[PDB]
Amino acid sequence: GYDNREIVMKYIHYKLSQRGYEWDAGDSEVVHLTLRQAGDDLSRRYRRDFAEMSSQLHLTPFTARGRFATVVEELFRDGVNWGRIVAFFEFGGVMCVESVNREMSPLVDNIALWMTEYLNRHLHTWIQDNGGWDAFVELYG
Numbered sequence: 001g002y003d004n005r006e007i008v009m010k011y012i013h014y015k016l017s018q019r020g021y022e023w024d025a026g027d028s029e030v031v032h033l034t035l036r037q038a039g040d041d042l043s044r045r046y047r048r049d050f051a052e053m054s055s056q057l058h059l060t061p062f063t064a065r066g067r068f069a070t071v072v073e074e075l076f077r078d079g080v081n082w083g084r085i086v087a088f089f090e091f092g093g094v095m096c097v098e099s100v101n102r103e104m105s106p107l108v109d110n111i112a113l114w115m116t117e118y119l120n121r122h123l124h125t126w127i128q129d130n131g132g133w134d135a136f137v138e139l140y141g
């Protein structure tokens with residue numbers, strides 16, 4: 001079936017490579033393509049929000065997890081839908097890009113871990129019960 005670690009790895013590798021960043025640890029195909037196209041589209045529609053988020057993160061090694069948790073909680077405070085999940089992936093991408101910009105590339109591995117466990121444990125039942133990634137693909141692919 002669907003592999004959350006693979007979904008996270010391919011998405012973060014795509015987003016980083018797209019902007020010229022490296023990630024050695026990253027360096028069913030329809031789900032990966034649909035997700036990255038949806039995330040690209042979201043980032044174009046809400047470019048101002050993304051640019052403001054990138055500017056405000058101010059990451060350090062000891063604060064990165066708290067910044068991640070703080071934004072994810074606000075993102076889903078009104079409930080989960082597919083668009084907020086795409087935003088969750090795009091935010092992870094922004095977290096990874098800013099980690100490298102602050103000379104903290106090792107954080108990319110941690111962020112990828114946090115995203116994977118969020119899918120595995122926090123979002124898993126919602127995704128499964130609302131049709132899984134196959135429904136996401138039929139809706140937006």
Ligand SMILES: CC1(C)CCC(CN2CCN(c3ccc(C(=O)NS(=O)(=O)c4ccc(NCC5CCOCC5)c([N+](=O)[O-])c4)c(Oc4cnc5[nH]ccc5c4)c3)CC2)=C(c2ccc(Cl)cc2)C1
Pocket residue numbers: 037038039041042045046049050053071074075081082083084086087088090091092094140
């Ligand atoms: C602290 C913060 C919380 C503050 C706020 C923000 C920014 N906010 C986050 C929430 N946000 C949302 C949330 C839900 C929806 C939505 O409509 N939901 S929906 O009805 O389920 C759905 C509807 C369409 C598609 N797809 C279209 C297809 C078109 C053809 O091409 C393929 C895709 C999908 N879908 O999943 O694909 C799902 C949405 O509107 C859209 C509009 N266009 C979209 N395109 C792709 C997804 C999508 C969603 C936008 C707006 C921006 C913060 C923030 C900052 C930086 C980063 Cl980095 C991240 C977050 C932080």
